[PDB]
């Protein structure tokens, strides 16, 4: 807070591996425009929109900071160290700092732009630590810290939605004025710091099972229990054993599922019509349909079917050059959840078969497929994996009830997540008239701000204690020659993340 | 316990609002007849009854006290204070007192009844604090303390059911003799007091969400994730944004549902046949069908459909003059759960759509409706609201397993609820014969008793901390003129509750 | 509180004169029926009523005690002692007691009534010490303690009014349940006691002025000030003196007035038409007209006009045998306020004359009468007198503003007056049915109660310090023979108050 | 510029049985939300709000 000629912070970007902990530190340079020309605005969908797409809400003049992706905090090498050596990890605490604030004024003049420092201007910042504002982190929006530390990013604009009926609003709809919160005001000498402790959450499981739920028995020994092995010409009963594993009695059940449509990576194997919407699995809420994407954690495909993926059931990331609209398959990266096929149903199949009738002398036994199956006692399952470029946490909705609140896009469910950090350039009016006018001032000096931001996160690690004799699968770079090195810049300075990297490499018994 | 000419208690009827607590106190005058002419009786259904309606059980000579409705403890104004100002509440402890006991004897004589005090007669009372008797509170029976403190009420008779097979009993059926418990005996000078502490339970949610589960995103910013936006003439992938909210990836799912039939308040929109039973949703247990009423918490109707309600899915109260059998629509009050449509499916619709097949070059993608959906990981929901005239608590059945034991009629699930309080007039034999007869005595003096009863409950309150700028919805009386004042007596002294009042007025973000 | 055979209080009826204080004690026997057959009832005016007479309210089963008249506490001799010897008095504190409670049950049988003691029955009593109920004392209602201590009285029924629009009610109308208050319950052995301290109030003025406001000057000496004594043929100015007192300059003004119509006690001097309503002075409030009775304190008549009285401007009491409706003049007693004619305008005249125009060479000077005149700086006045049979106190309405809140019927204005004391017989149900019926009980044993009540009031006195040489006027009995003695019983035991007795006998200078 | 004001409150102690009149937003749908900004950022106060809702005896 000293003054104009003194830096208010240093560049901290590092990773420190200590025993059962790893501390990441990330610093970036940011730029904040004036949004909405300083105004709050009501926003809503157009009259012609599909009912599924209607909304009502507000856009605000404020921006906000989003570090909610793993590559904000972990270099690719660090991620490798994590996933090859640890069975699990979770966040413990964080520190946040905003510093080296610079406010600039822009003047159009006659033909060219002119930029100068406005030494007396201020930026406002506050953390919503009581969770009093709509929480828009955790929706997988753009605008995070860029993965490559040398890139400079634009702070995204804050807006929110409230109750809508069509394009209109309801009496219970809420409007929030962010100036109705206390906030710190910073001139170029000032800085802002915030610290937070994560609530206890279970370790993410970074491991794959080396056994499947249906093969947990001793293959050498028969069961003492009997099953009905013969109906023809009278009932008969047998003890199951190594030659009939499908018949053995078991203690547990695979996890729940909600079946999705199956898409082929081979173009000629797909229907040529338009099923993009009609093929998706959807939930129906207050008259509106929403795709269930990614939906319950389910394995992407069964053995030797790797060409298939569920229509709305996997996270999909773009390659560096991918278009925003209608990018082709070769321009995207499709995640693969196959490692959980040991406990979880495959996303594109049935849960199983249920009996539908009463068999008798004249009536055959009938079954039908169960394509959607909720929780049953004795079920076990794995949650979806997390990815280097994927999200970290989400806010658990505040409700009477929830079940297993692991956010379905992956990551850590938190009742009290890292708070939203809001920032805004304080408006500076231009010269007012010399006769009093009661109207609110509409004329402002054009400004923007820039600075540095840092976030430090301490992560707890769960070590591997395996007695496995043979070597593990490990994430590795290719050792062969190539034109570029993976996860680097090219000749034009563009950083790119060529592939997605999950966490499940090491193994564990069921 | 002093004697004949000294009152054994005072009239305590009050409400005290202290900070984060509210203490209600309620006193009423009661009258207790002799039930069953002092006998225990086996009771069962008739041979001609429908199998769904068979039962076996016992009626007892005892009566019992029931204060298990909110209007026993809260005046309408008090309820208003509660719901307009608080996000939640729960019970903490209670005190119970029985006092000013009066026992009367009735003599028929020749032409007219004569009533006199029997100063030496006693009444017996005990609280089943070990939960050793069938617990019949929590079935929404009549016989509670009346809502208006000046009304005098009859104590209801205690009876219970046990295992039946048709109209018969099973070896494991239980018979309970209430005289096989210790009980206090009270003459006109004596009184009885009991105190109880509620177990920790979560706050009832008295609030509505100001956001819906499908609109939790920032409307200004696109997602970094991709979805499959085009199948026709090849696959294509897009990032979802403000113009396609139905396609965005999300972390959570709406709550479970079991779909019910839809009834219209407009008479001409209903089928004219008899579907009253065949239209209901039912569960099948040991060969018997029971309606699932009200069933899982589900919103009553979607936007602009307020004329519809689920057939068996809402609490329905009678107006003061409503008949017991076949009252018309205008004589009943139908509750409305619309506020939970933000997180819970509408009761009369599907949960969603699930994929049923494998699409290919020659085969279109198929889906079907899911009309019943159990719990999935990542679901969130609200429980049913409570009402001024609705129930307060229920006993959680003693079982190996249960899930989210919020009683489906609404209110607080308790493993150890407020105990049943049983009361009986001690039999007084008439003059026996002057020669010994071993038969049990069948001739008794006709008696009844009357007294006062008080219950005090301490409730804990959860305050509202909202940053909402615009005013809330609030429960209000109508300000216009009217012939009567709502929630008062009429010119004949009849008290009436004109409308139902829920708890959900204030709002909160998800 | 001992029991059946022990009295719970003694008969205290006395007056003790100590120095500058007088303590009155009054005991009476009361009887309380069941009112409204135990019910609360909405009550309102009929459709055909005049708009001025519409109302809406409730009648309650409760009774209440009213001691708000002076003859409840002062014997006629005591009142004489007070008014002949003291310049003022005010209440200081009181004690109240209810005791020797007896509850009786009445049985109709075949041909004659039978009355018996119900030893276990209770009566309920409470004092509204927080002023939470409509306060109906101070409206000059019947039902007070009788003036003669041997008379036994019926406790009056409590009811109240709330906002009405015509015969209907408004949303802001209030309904009060008196069972929603704590109250003490008394059996025949129990008693109830209450104590209260009056707030500081000014002494009532029991004295008449021996000077008039317009004669306060020294009759022997001229003024140094001049007045305009001559306009004809030029202005001229004179100093006023003993021969022109009407012209002297003065410091003060007579009190306010609102002129009323003049009625003659001589029948032939009155108009023979119907002016009973059209002749009254009235205020207009929310479309309703109310007579202004008695209205502002004004002298009843001027000197030698004692046959006249203001139409609605004096308290009027009935003689013992007076009818309730259309009693003739000889059957009523009309109070006379003539003693305040020294400072207050006469009720049937104008306040004075005000100038209405601008006089000049061609225009004469004009004045007009002022028949209604509000307060002006420099005004002085006396409040209305109090009477042996008149009211004592009134509750000052709770409002933003008031001016000189001496209640216009006379007596002491109190922000926190003696609280209402409410009493009710607890209902005792008759024998209920032997099968449970949820309807409220409609069948009760017929009962009433009786007991004694005592009130003790301490009064502070202001002594007379006059230097007057000649004897005072004094209130006196007539010394001559008569058939009856004033303020006694007649040969049939009827007590009667033959005349009204004010307080203003002794004199004081202005 | 900032201004902070401390206000003292007088609580309600009524024994009224029936519910009070209360100031409330309308619960129905509408194009705009009362006491908010519109699509152009203009804040507006649609109606006046007095203080007299709760009741008291004279």
Ordered DSSP codes for C208-247? EESS-TT--S-TTS--SSEEEEE-TTS-EEEE--TT--TT
Q: Which residues, at least 6 apart from A509, have a Cβ–Cβ distance to it below 8 Å?
A: A209, A210, A211
Strands B253-254 and B236-239: unpaired
Pick the closest to residue A310 from B254, B240, B227, B350 (CA basis): B227
Considering CB atoms only, which of D17, D21, D56 is closest to C176?
A: D17
Q: Which residues, at least 6 apart from B491, have a Cβ–Cβ distance to it below 8 Å?
A: C41, C42, C43, C44
Residue C73 corresponds to which tokens in the numbers above?
Answer: 């506490």
C475 and C50 Cβ atoms separated by less than 8 Å: no
Q: What is the chain D residue with the closest CA to A163?
A: D29
Q: Which residues, at least 6 apart from C178, have a Cβ–Cβ distance to it below 8 Å?
A: C60, C62, C133, C158, C422, C424
Experimental method: cryo-EM
CA distance A39 to chain D (A): 5
The whole-angstrom separation of Cα B259 and Cα B373 is: 9
The whole-angstrom separation of Cα C309 and Cα C335 is: 9
A96 and A90 Cβ atoms separated by less than 8 Å: no
Which residues is A305 bridged to in the sheet?
none
B256 and B299 Cβ atoms separated by less than 8 Å: no
Pick the closest to residue C411 from C68, C45, C7 (CA basis): C68
Using the structure block, give the residue that is written with the tokens 């104009």: A4
Which residues is C262 bridged to in the sheet?
C310
Strands B507-508 and B208-209: parallel
C332 and C316 Cβ atoms separated by less than 8 Å: yes
Residue B78 corresponds to which tokens in the numbers above?
Answer: 């008090």
Mutate to test the interface with D, among B15, B304, B471, B499 (most CBs of D within 10 A): B471
The whole-angstrom separation of Cα A442 and Cα A444 is: 7
Report yes or no: B234 at the A interface, CB cutoff 8 Å.
yes
Gyration radius of chain C's alpha carbons: 28
Pick the closest to residue C238 from C214, C222, C257, C262 (CA basis): C222
A103 and A188 Cβ atoms separated by less than 8 Å: yes
C-alpha to C-alpha distances, A394 to A59, A205, A501, B245, nearest whole angstrom = 22, 17, 20, 18
B41 and B56 Cβ atoms separated by less than 8 Å: no
CA distance C12 to chain B (A): 24
The whole-angstrom separation of Cα C338 and Cα C297 is: 11
C260 and C312 Cβ atoms separated by less than 8 Å: yes
B259 and B349 Cβ atoms separated by less than 8 Å: yes
Give the dihedral sign, CA A2/A7/A8/A9.
Answer: negative
Quick one: C217 exposed, middle or buried, by C-beta within 10 A (0-12, 13-18, 19+)? Answer: middle
D32 and A40 Cβ atoms separated by less than 8 Å: no
Pick the closest to residue D53 from C403, B471, B484 (CA basis): B471
Residues of B in contact with D51 (CB under 8 A): none
Pick the closest to residue A206 from A480, A463, A487, A378 (CA basis): A463
User: In this structure, what are the phi and psi dihedrals at residue A490, rounded to the nearest 5 degrees?
Assistant: -95, -170
C176 and C134 Cβ atoms separated by less than 8 Å: yes
One-character DSSP codes across C52-88: GG--EEEEEEEEEEB--BGGGT--HHHHHHHHHHEEE
Residue A30, classed as helix, strand or coil, is strand
Residue C197, classed as helix, strand or coil, is strand
b/e map A484-504, b = 16+ CB within 10 Å: eeebeeeeeeeeebeebbbbb
Residue A171 corresponds to which tokens in the numbers above?
Answer: 């009496």
Query: For residue B398, how many C-alpha atoms fall within 13 Å in the half-sphere facing its CB?
Result: 7
B431 and B133 Cβ atoms separated by less than 8 Å: no
Pick the closest to residue C338 from C312, C310, C311, C380 (CA basis): C310
C-alpha to C-alpha distances, C382 to A155, A309, C410, C465, nearest whole angstrom = 79, 101, 11, 20
**Backbone dihedral region for residue B455 (phi beyond 0: left; psi -120 to 50: alpha; all else: beta):** beta
| Strand intervals (E) in B226-268 | 226-230, 236-239, 253-254, 257-258, 262-264
Pick the closest to residue A256 from A378, A411, A405 (CA basis): A378
Give the dihedral sign, CA A74/A77/A80/A86.
Answer: negative
Q: What is the chain D residue with the closest CA to B501?
A: D19
Pick the closest to residue A43 from A158, A131, A137 (CA basis): A158
C305 and C262 Cβ atoms separated by less than 8 Å: no
CA distance B453 to chain D (A): 21
Pick the closest to residue A504 from A299, A310, A361 (CA basis): A299
Q: Do A and C have ≥3 inter-chain CB pairs under 8 A?
A: no
Report yes or no: C148 at the D interface, CB cutoff 8 Å.
no
The whole-angstrom separation of Cα A475 and Cα C8 is: 97
Residue A413 corresponds to which tokens in the numbers above?
Answer: 């469910």
CA dihedral C319, C323, C327, C333 (to 10 degrees): 10
Report yes or no: B400 at the A interface, CB cutoff 8 Å.
no
Residue A393 corresponds to which tokens in the numbers above?
Answer: 């946490």
Are D33 and A169 a contacting pair at CB < 8 A? yes
- Residue B295, preceding peptide bond in cis (omega within 30° of 0): no
The whole-angstrom separation of Cα A322 and Cα B167 is: 73
Residue A285, classed as helix, strand or coil, is strand
Q: Which residues, at least 6 apart from B132, have a Cβ–Cβ distance to it below 8 Å?
A: B176, B181
C59 and C177 Cβ atoms separated by less than 8 Å: no
Residues of C in contact with D55 (CB under 8 A): 172, 174
Are B378 and A283 a contacting pair at CB < 8 A? no
CA distance C425 to chain B (A): 12
Cα–chain-centroid distance for residue A363? 51
Residue B275 corresponds to which tokens in the numbers above?
Answer: 């579907």
C393 and C418 Cβ atoms separated by less than 8 Å: yes
The whole-angstrom separation of Cα C485 and Cα C77 is: 13
- Three-state SS for A51-68 is HHHCCEEEEEEEEEEECC
Documented resolution in Å: 1.8
A266 and A319 Cβ atoms separated by less than 8 Å: no
The whole-angstrom separation of Cα A463 and Cα B327 is: 69
Residue B451, classed as helix, strand or coil, is strand
Chains with ≥3 CB–CB distances under 8 Å to C? B, D
Residue B42 corresponds to which tokens in the numbers above?
Answer: 């086996």
Residue C482, classed as helix, strand or coil, is coil
| Strand intervals (E) in B108-156 | 114-117, 123-127, 152-154
Q: DSSP secondary-structure letter at B188?
A: T
The whole-angstrom separation of Cα A420 and Cα A407 is: 18
Report yes or no: B258 at the A interface, CB cutoff 8 Å.
no
Residue C367 corresponds to which tokens in the numbers above?
Answer: 């004045």
C-alpha to C-alpha distances, A110 to A113, A114, C395, nearest whole angstrom = 9, 10, 80
Pick the closest to residue A423 from A98, A176, A134 (CA basis): A98
Q: DSSP secondary-structure letter at A140?
A: -
Strands C56-65 and C41-44: antiparallel
Gyration radius of chain A's alpha carbons: 28
Give the dihedral sign, CA A217/A218/A223/A224.
Answer: negative
Which residues is B14 bridged to in the sheet?
B25
The whole-angstrom separation of Cα B8 and Cα C223 is: 80
Q: Which residues, at least 6 apart from C414, have a Cβ–Cβ distance to it below 8 Å?
A: C198, C199, C201, C393, C394, C395, C396
Which residues is C150 bridged to in the sheet?
none
Residue B471, classed as helix, strand or coil, is coil
Are D20 and B470 a contacting pair at CB < 8 A? no
Residues of A in contact with B382 (CB under 8 A): 399-401
Q: Do B and C have ≥3 inter-chain CB pairs under 8 A?
A: yes
Mutate to test the interface with A, among D23, D29, D44, D45 (most CBs of A within 10 A): D29
User: In this structure, what are the phi and psi dihedrals at residue A262, rounded to the nearest 5 degrees?
Assistant: -105, 125
One-character DSSP codes across A396-439: PP--SEESS---TTSSEEESS-SPPEEEEEPP-B-PPPSS---S
Pick the closest to residue C71 from C500, C505, C504, C361 (CA basis): C500
The whole-angstrom separation of Cα C490 and Cα A121 is: 100
b/e map C5-27, b = 16+ CB within 10 Å: eeebbeeeeebeeeeeebbbbbb
Residues of D in contact with B470 (CB under 8 A): 25, 33-36
Residue A269, classed as helix, strand or coil, is helix
C142 and C156 Cβ atoms separated by less than 8 Å: yes
Q: How many CB atoms lie within 10 A of CB B481?
A: 16
Q: DSSP secondary-structure letter at A78?
A: H
CA distance D47 to chain C (A): 21
The whole-angstrom separation of Cα C187 and Cα B5 is: 5
User: In this structure, what are the phi and psi dihedrals at residue A107, rounded to the nearest 5 degrees?
Assistant: -120, 125
Using the structure block, give the residue that is written with the tokens 């030496």: B120
Residue A7, classed as helix, strand or coil, is coil
Q: Which residues, at least 6 apart from C225, have a Cβ–Cβ distance to it below 8 Å?
A: C239, C240, C249
Residue C136, classed as helix, strand or coil, is coil
- Residue C64, preceding peptide bond in cis (omega within 30° of 0): no
The whole-angstrom separation of Cα C154 and Cα B322 is: 40
Residue B230, classed as helix, strand or coil, is strand
Report yes or no: C170 at the B interface, CB cutoff 8 Å.
yes
CA distance C397 to chain D (A): 5
User: In this structure, what are the phi and psi dihedrals at residue B37, rounded to the nearest 5 degrees?
Assistant: 50, 40
Helix, strand, coil proportions of chain C in percent (round to 5)?
A: 5, 35, 60
A394 and B251 Cβ atoms separated by less than 8 Å: yes
Report yes or no: C276 at the D interface, CB cutoff 8 Å.
no
Cα of first residue to Cα of last residue in chain B, in angstroms, is 56
| Strand intervals (E) in A198-351 | 204-205, 208-209, 226-230, 236-239, 253-254, 257-258, 262-264, 282-285, 288-291, 308-310, 316-318, 332-334
Cα–chain-centroid distance for residue A222? 46
A243 and A284 Cβ atoms separated by less than 8 Å: no
A370 and A351 Cβ atoms separated by less than 8 Å: yes
Using the structure block, give the residue that is written with the tokens 């909720």: A374
C38 and C429 Cβ atoms separated by less than 8 Å: no
Pick the closest to residue C494 from C69, C146, C77, C67 (CA basis): C146
CA dihedral B212, B218, B221, B227 (to 10 degrees): -30
Are D33 and A175 a contacting pair at CB < 8 A? yes
B363-367: Cβ within 8 A, 24+ apart: B363/A271, B364/A271, B364/A273, B364/A275, B365/A261, B365/A271, B365/A275, B365/A278, B365/A279, B365/A311, B367/A278, B367/A279, B367/A281
The whole-angstrom separation of Cα C402 and Cα C410 is: 16
One-character DSSP codes across C395-452: EPP--S--SS---TTSSEEESS-SPPEEEEEPP-B-PPPSS---SPP--B--EEEEEE
Q: Which residues, at least 6 apart from A68, have a Cβ–Cβ distance to it below 8 Å?
A: A137, A138, A144, A391, A392, A393, A418
Quick one: B392 exposed, middle or buried, by C-beta within 10 A (0-12, 13-18, 19+)? Answer: buried
Pick the closest to residue C5 from B488, B4, A106, D54 (CA basis): B4
User: In this structure, what are the phi and psi dihedrals at residue B51, rounded to the nearest 5 degrees?
Assistant: -55, -35
Pick the closest to residue C423 from C11, C88, C66 (CA basis): C66
Using the structure block, give the residue that is written with the tokens 């009184």: B191
Report yes or no: B252 at the A interface, CB cutoff 8 Å.
yes
The whole-angstrom separation of Cα C297 and Cα C391 is: 15
Using the structure block, give the residue that is written with the tokens 């008449």: C208
Query: For residue D55, how many C-alpha atoms fall within 13 Å in the half-sphere facing its CB?
Result: 25
Q: Which residues, at least 6 apart from A151, have a Cβ–Cβ distance to it below 8 Å?
A: A28, A495
């Amino acid at each position: 807070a000293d003054g104009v000629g003194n830096a208010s912070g240093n560049w901290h970007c590092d990773s420190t591996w200590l025993g059962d902990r790893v501390i990441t530190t990330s610093t970036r340079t940011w730029a904040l425009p004036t949004y909405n020309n300083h105004l709050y605005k009501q926003i809503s969908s157009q009259s012609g929109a599909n009912n599924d797409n209607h909304y009502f809400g507000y856009s605000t003049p404020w921006g906000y900071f989003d570090f909610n992706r793993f590559h904000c905090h972990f270099s690719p090498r660090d991620w490798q160290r994590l996933i090859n050596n640890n069975w699990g990890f979770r966040p413990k605490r964080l520190n946040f700092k905003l510093f080296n604030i610079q406010v600039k004024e822009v003047t159009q003049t006659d033909g060219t732009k002119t930029i100068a420092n406005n030494l007396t201007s201020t930026v406002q910042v506050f953390a919503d630590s009581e969770y009093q504002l709509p929480y828009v982190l955790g929706s997988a929006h753009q605008g995070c810290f860029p993965p490559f530390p040398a890139d400079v990013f634009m702070v995204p604009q804050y807006g929110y939605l409230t109750l809508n009926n069509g394009s209109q609003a309801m009496g219970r709809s809420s409007f929030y004025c962010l100036e109705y919160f206390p906030s710190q005001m910073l001139r170029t000498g000032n800085n802002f710091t915030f610290s937070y402790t994560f609530e206890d959450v279970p370790f993410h499981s970074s491991y794959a099972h080396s056994q499947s739920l249906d093969r947990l028995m001793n293959p050498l020994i028969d069961q003492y229990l009997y099953y009905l092995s013969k109906t023809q010409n009278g009932l008969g009963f047998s003890q199951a054993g190594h030659n009939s594993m499908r018949d053995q009695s078991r203690n547990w059940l695979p996890g729940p599922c909600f079946r999705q449509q199956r898409i082929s990576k081979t173009p000629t194997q797909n229907n040529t019509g338009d099923f993009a919407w009609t093929g998706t699995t959807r939930y129906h809420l207050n008259g509106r349909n929403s795709a269930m994407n990614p939906g319950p954690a389910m394995a992407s495909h069964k053995d030797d079917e790797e060409r298939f993926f569920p229509q709305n059931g996997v996270l999909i990331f773009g390659k560096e050059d991918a278009e925003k609209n209608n990018a082709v398959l070769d321009k995207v990266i499709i995640t693969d959840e196959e490692e959980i096929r040991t406990t979880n149903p495959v996303a594109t199949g049935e849960y199983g078969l249920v009996a539908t009738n009463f068999q008798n002398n004249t009536t055959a036994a009938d079954t039908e497929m169960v394509n959607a199956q909720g929780i049953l006692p004795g079920m076990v399952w794995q949650d979806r994996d997390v990815y280097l470029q994927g999200p970290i946490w989400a806010k658990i909705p505040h409700t009477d009830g929830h079940f297993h609140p692991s956010p379905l896009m992956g990551g850590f469910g938190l009742k009290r997540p890292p708070p939203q950090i809001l920032i805004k350039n304080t408006p500076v009016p231009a010269d007012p008239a010399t006769t009093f006018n009661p109207a609110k001032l509409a004329s402002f000096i054009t400004q923007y701000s820039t600075g540095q931001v840092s976030v430090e996160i301490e992560w707890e690690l769960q070590k591997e204690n395996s007695k496995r004799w043979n070597p593990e699968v490990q994430y590795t770079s290719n050792y062969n020659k190539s034109v570029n090195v993976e996860f680097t810049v090219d000749n034009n300075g563009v950083y790119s993340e060529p592939r997605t990297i999950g966490t499940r490499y090491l193994t564990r018994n069921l």
